[PDB]
Symmetry: C3
Subunit: 176 residues, 3 copies
């Protein structure tokens, strides 16, 4: 009966789509694009600069202002942070929390400061250094997202008891 193998037609599953008999690959421009062939991102990179007030959440109840540059290039966002002021610590380890609500400025493309579900699944490396009693301490530390808006880094304070650390730098990156 009268049909050909073509009669029933083809359906196209995302990221493939058809419109008006024209079949396309839908491309997130932060990840990929076409220049005849499928290649890497076309979206413009940006370098965001803002202040992030980080909060001590264990081994500190203090806060510390961080000057942040976030270099967003494709779906990678790299953070370079430097403190102003001292952070008061109370123990040999401190947890420092970075919640998007504590950024001033607040970039328009806030999506670039939010990790992917995949990336959120694990602890991630963070380079930390700071000065305490005129010595530099520097550590390969780790951060972890507790939710899509909030990560916390854990690092040693270079001593015990109450002390004030300064010149805290934080370097890390996330996949968004």
């Amino acid at each position: 009966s009268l049909e050909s193998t073509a009669s029933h037609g083809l359906s196209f599953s995302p990221p493939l789509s058809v419109a008006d008999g024209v079949v396309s690959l839908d491309m997130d421009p932060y990840f990929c694009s076409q220049r005849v062939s499928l290649t890497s991102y076309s979206a413009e990179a940006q370098l965001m600069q803002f202040r992030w007030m980080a909060r001590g959440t264990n081994g500190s109840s203090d806060t510390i202002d961080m000057t942040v540059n976030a270099h967003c290039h494709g779906r990678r966002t790299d953070y370079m942070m430097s403190s102003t002021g001292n952070l008061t610590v109370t123990s040999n380890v401190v947890l420092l929390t970075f919640d998007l609500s504590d950024i001033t400025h607040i970039p328009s493309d806030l999506a670039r400061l939010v990790p992917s579900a995949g990336f959120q699944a694990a602890s991630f490396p963070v380079d930390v250094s700071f000065t305490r009693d005129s010595a530099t301490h520097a550590y390969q530390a780790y951060g972890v997202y507790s939710s899509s808006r909030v990560f916390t880094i854990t690092f040693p304070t270079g001593g015990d008891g109450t002390a004030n650390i300064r010149s805290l730098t934080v370097r890390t990156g996330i996949d968004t």
Copy 2:
């Protein structure tokens, strides 16, 4: 004769595939995914921790235990390694070999510690530092895969003759 331009039908070459008249893009979830549009990886990142006994293969016949964190995020795996113990070196340059067979633990997703054929094609940068006679030496070094399971890094030892280096750190990453 009786056919239309549709009669002979369309064939779909990988990573495109058809099943039941539904055309799909097959996506490696470590590389890409769809959220309407084609975007970056959906697979969960992981932070693997294990001990890697590295072997001196020139300028040393010794071995050294490395504490390794491997942060696997998409098809990128970044290594952060720190030694325990001393490595005995005999020359001004040492070659230190990292073979998957010498990892204890042995993560289930061992595929994350294997570089792609493309990445294997070239030497890759490795940051190395260690202490020798109370001085720190630190170098931009290079590694190269001799096979898919084995890479070797080459770095200066900071002197000559027989000596023992300690606090060896290795930072590098691979594309898998």
Copy 3:
């Protein structure tokens, strides 16, 4: 009238293409490939080594030879550069320009030293360090492409007036 929903046929928009009833995804091998599913790059990585004469363009009218290793892996190119000689600086900030025309050698795949339009859109982080009067200065600096062949980095010189800096290292990367 006589047509079916198949009569008019399907058109395929780049990076999808049809030839001889076979529908393909065209893949830039520096970005992606297929191993049944769509995955990451298949092109061979390379480690290019060349000399780059950088030019002082503000706070210096001098030039400085840089020994460059460019690790090209997919569409990421990472630069590791170390100077030979001194650079004469005249101010507390220097601008150092890296134009492809000043590379000797001149790799065949010069496309790997050219950033994407997207990446070019923003300033990018550059790690800089150098020695001046027997002290090391080290900074998170920034570079910016003024055109597809030319970027300039800006960094502090660690003092004022006329001076000569040495052991300048530059580490950064670009998306191509």
